[PDB]
Amino acid sequence: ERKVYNDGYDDDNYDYIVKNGEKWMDRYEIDSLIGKGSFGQVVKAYDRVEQEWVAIKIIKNKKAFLNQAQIEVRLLELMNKHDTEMKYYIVHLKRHFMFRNHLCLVFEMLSYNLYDLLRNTNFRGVSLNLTRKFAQQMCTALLFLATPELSIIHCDLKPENILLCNPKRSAIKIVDFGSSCQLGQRIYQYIQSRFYRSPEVLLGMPYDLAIDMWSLGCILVEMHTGEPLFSGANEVDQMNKIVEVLGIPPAHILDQAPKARKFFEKLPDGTWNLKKTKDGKREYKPPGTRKLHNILGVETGGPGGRRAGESGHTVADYLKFKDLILRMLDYDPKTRIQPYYALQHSFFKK
Numbered sequence: 001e002r003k004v005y006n007d008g009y010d011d012d013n014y015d016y017i018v019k020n021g022e023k024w025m026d027r028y029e030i031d032s033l034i035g036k037g038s039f040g041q042v043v044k045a046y047d048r049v050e051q052e053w054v055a056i057k058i059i060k061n062k063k064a065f066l067n068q069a070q071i072e073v074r075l076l077e078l079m080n081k082h083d084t085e086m087k088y089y090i091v092h093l094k095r096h097f098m099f100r101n102h103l104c105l106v107f108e109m110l111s112y113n114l115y116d117l118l119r120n121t122n123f124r125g126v127s128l129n130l131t132r133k134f135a136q137q138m139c140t141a142l143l144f145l146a147t148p149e150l151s152i153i154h155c156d157l158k159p160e161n162i163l164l165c166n167p168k169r170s171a172i173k174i175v176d177f178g179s180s181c182q183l184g185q186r187i188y189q190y191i192q193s194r195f196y197r198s199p200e201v202l203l204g205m206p207y208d209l210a211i212d213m214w215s216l217g218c219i220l221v222e223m224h225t226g227e228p229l230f231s232g233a234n235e236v237d238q239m240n241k242i243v244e245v246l247g248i249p250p251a252h253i254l255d256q257a258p259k260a261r262k263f264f265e266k267l268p269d270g271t272w273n274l275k276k277t278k279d280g281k282r283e284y285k286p287p288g289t290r291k292l293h294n295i296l297g298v299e300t301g302g303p304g305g306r307r308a309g310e311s312g313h314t315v316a317d318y319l320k321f322k323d324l325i326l327r328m329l330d331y332d333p334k335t336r337i338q339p340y341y342a343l344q345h346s347f348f349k350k
């Protein structure tokens with residue numbers, strides 16, 4: 001098999017074969033590939049006509065992907081057009097078009113994504129002050145998505161999709177609404193990147209805007225610790241790693257959860273344990289015995305003690321932080337902290 005795909009324009013994974021230097025439509029001059037992804041690719045390009053850099057997202061050339069990309073565009077256009085100043089936490093879709101059988105979304109050019117940021121500081125993690133700054137921005141963002149007329153679930157929050165507007169600055173915007181959808185109009189059950197996946201989704205329960213808040217919890221912790229909080233290799237592993245920190249989930253949730261039996265079992269007395277495990281195998285810490293309080297290093301100089309004796313990393317501060325995250329990681333989506341209240345939390349009080 002060495003077929004030629006799309007008159008030689010595409011590779012075998014439906015991606016457009018990026019060539020640096022190429023000028024499209026006597027307008028966009030393609031500089032370089034900046035990133036790949038299930039959706040396709042993103043390229044750095046200079047827009048002659050508007051005299052500015054843009055980032056163009058070249059969707060795979062396959063109906064399945066195109067159809068999704070269209071929903072994305074539609075949502076990007078509701079958010080961009082919406083009124084109050086909160087609309088500058090969502091990336092600006094400048095325009096979009098078909099080219100060589102690829103749908104292309106032209107975005108404002110932005111800087112690093114929070115993962116690339118983490119990596120540049122060799123995964124020692126960013127400061128708490130800065131983690132707070134991202135925290136506050138994201139929260140306002142989620143409140144924007146909450147406005148009734150939008151009611152948008154992102155469904156894939158994660159460091160790669162939070163980008164800096166400027167490399168020597170702190171201001172940021174959310175990207176990639178490929179998986180996203182409006183409340184009610186929910187059409188997928190396997191959503192969210194595994195590490196950042198919520199319990200409700202894992203359990204195969206129905207889900208709402210709450211699931212993004214969850215992801216944000218895991219993000220913020222990771223951003224400071226340098227390393228993801230629930231690093232599951234698979235759904236079962238992921239659920240156990242959540243249980244390590246947060247315990248068995250509540251009766252009233254597991255009772256209603258279709259996939260509850262993938263991970264847990266119900267004892268005669270109506271209480272839930274983790275599923276019994278092969279004769280002798282020990283692999284996890286006992287439920288709730290991996291206290292966030294130590295992962296964060298609240299009383300021991302922060303994560304890995306790497307903040308020992310630093311300005312702006314007081315124990316009092318870490319406590320405020322722990323509490324916020326813990327309300328972002330509420331098993332119950334009906335009682336998980338909502339943005340309006342998250343913003344009025346002691347961790348943001350100047």
Ligand SMILES: O=C1N=C(Nc2ccccc2)N=C1Cc1ccc2c(c1)OCO2
Nearest residue numbers: 035037042055107108109110160175176
């Ligand atoms: O919708 C998206 N999905 C993306 N996926 C992605 C792109 C690069 C690395 C990891 C993930 N990127 C965007 C948009 C995007 C928008 C503006 C940009 C940008 C990327 O790179 C920096 O400028």
